[PDB]
Amino acid sequence: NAAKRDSQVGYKTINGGTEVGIHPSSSLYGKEYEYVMYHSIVLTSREYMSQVTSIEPQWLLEVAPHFYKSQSRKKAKIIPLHNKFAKDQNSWRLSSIRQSRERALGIKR
RNA sequence: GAAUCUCUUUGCCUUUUGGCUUAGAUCAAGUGUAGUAUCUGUUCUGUAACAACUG
């Protein structure tokens, strides 16, 4: 039961990629560490981890080289920075410019 | 020596590039229907002689 701190969605689980969270009653709420292990986990309105400690990936390797030791790097994608003035953050694309052109001309595929 | 025809190099070029400026400048991603162009395929393969008249 360990967790990896992702910048966009907060925390991913090592098993299955479940978006979890730190409970505010814990000691580690206002602070952040990158790799943490959690004693318990509760499904509610939001996930919550309980008894969370900082951990280093050297320890997670030297203890368990049998549970584990790319493809997720290949399947990833990125999206640009968000602006308020654009009103649809896909309209910069060449596909969306093509679609807006062919809609204004009035053709249909 | 000289004429006629015909072929090689050698001359001739004889349908043998007729202005300028910011290369004068920009850009070639639309649907249907229609016109024009072209391009692939298949099969099959009366005449002569004799007898008579010259009108």
Curated annotation (Swiss-Prot):
Domain of life: Eukaryota
Subcellular location(s) per record: Nucleus
Binding partners and assembly: Belongs to the CWC complex (or CEF1-associated complex), a spliceosome sub-complex reminiscent of a late-stage spliceosome composed of the U2, U5 and U6 snRNAs and at least BUD13, BUD31, BRR2, CDC40, CEF1, CLF1, CUS1, CWC2, CWC15, CWC21, CWC22, CWC23, CWC24, CWC25, CWC27, ECM2, HSH155, IST3, ISY1, LEA1, MSL1, NTC20, PRP8, PRP9, PRP11, PRP19, PRP21, PRP22, PRP45, PRP46, SLU7, SMB1, SMD1, SMD2, SMD3, SMX2, SMX3, SNT309, SNU114, SPP2, SYF1, SYF2, RSE1 and YJU2.
Its biological purpose: Acts late in the splicing of pre-mRNA. Mediates the release of the spliced mRNA from spliceosomes.
Family: Belongs to the DEAD box helicase family. DEAH subfamily. DDX8/PRP22 sub-subfamily.
Comment field (misc): Present with 907 molecules/cell in log phase SD medium.
Name of the protein described by the UniProt record: Pre-mRNA-splicing factor ATP-dependent RNA helicase PRP22
Organism: Saccharomyces cerevisiae (strain ATCC 204508 / S288c)
Full-length numbering of the shown residues: 1032 to 1145 of 1145
